[PDB]
Amino acid sequence: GSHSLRYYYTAVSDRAFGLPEFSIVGYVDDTQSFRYNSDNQKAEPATQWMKQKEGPEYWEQQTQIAKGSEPVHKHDVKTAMDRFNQTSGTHSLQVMYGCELREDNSIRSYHQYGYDGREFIALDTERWVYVPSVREAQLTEQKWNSPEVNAPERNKNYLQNLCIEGLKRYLSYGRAELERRVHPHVRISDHQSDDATELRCHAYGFYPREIDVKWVKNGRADVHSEAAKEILPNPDGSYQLRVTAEITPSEGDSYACHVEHSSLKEKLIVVW
């Protein structure tokens, strides 16, 4: 139904292997789309369908926004530590924002800072003022909310415009590939024996991410057995799920795996 553009910033006080001090990825609704990091400071597409769609103009525009947000964030991680009295240690700061387009003309948005795995400070969407989660984000709350800075009215003008303008535009470019239904192969197996039997029900290769797979005995829902919905991703669009069921105490009789996915009608697979 709805579609979302959204950006994720991660900034750290000391780098490590794999991590640059600062880096960005932006999702367009499920696909990873944009990328930037502080080693070789450049904004890149991250998916074929963003390649060769916007000119050199754009991108250098984007690389400059990113090269500007980088130092103010390395700075903020050192400031945050100070409000908490920390001198040693590695520390992280995380930023999230995004717009959601939906329904008819409905717009929704969010913008939040997180210092370590804890929410620090965040924007109320109808009131349009930043509300801290913590004492230490009171001094931030006041700088930003003040008349002279007025960050609520600035980000409001981005969240209600540029973000959606850019969303609408990127949805266009990835139109052919974002709705694109691809549907599940399914491969039942049943590990081992002894008294009762295991029964794995492997579905794979599908898009979108959402599915439902039960084990049905004749015409009644079977049993839990562990994990629950662990829909795993593949390194394309595709997704994957496996449901297990400890069964036959001894009686037998016609088990079956009921898949229910957005490319279908029903789909039902029999025993062995």
The footprint of another protein (CB under 8 A) covers: 7-8, 10, 12, 16-19, 23-27, 32, 34-35, 46, 61-62, 65-66, 68-69, 72, 75-76, 79-80, 90, 92, 94, 96-97, 113-114, 116-119, 140, 143-144, 149, 151, 154-155, 158, 162-163, 165-166, 185, 187, 202, 204-205, 230, 232-235, 238, 240
CB 72 → another protein: shortest distance, Å? 5
Nearer residue to another protein within complex by CB, 80 or 199: 80
Would the CA dihedral through 74, 77, 80, 84 be positive or negative?
negative
Q: How many Å separate Cα 189 from the centre of its chain?
A: 32
CB 156 → another protein: shortest distance, Å? 11
Spatial separation of the C-alpha atoms in residues 79 and 96, rounded to whole Å: 19
Nearer residue to another protein within complex by CB, 36 or 255: 36
Nearer residue to another protein within complex by CB, 203 or 247: 203
CB 212 → another protein: shortest distance, Å? 20
**Segments in the chain forming alpha helices (H):** 57-69, 71-83, 138-145, 151-157, 163-173, 175-178
CB 83 → another protein: shortest distance, Å? 9
The answer to whether the beta carbons of residues 241 and 260 sit under 8 Å apart is no
Q: How many Å separate Cα 84 from the centre of its chain?
A: 29
Spatial separation of the C-alpha atoms in residues 270 and 232, rounded to whole Å: 24
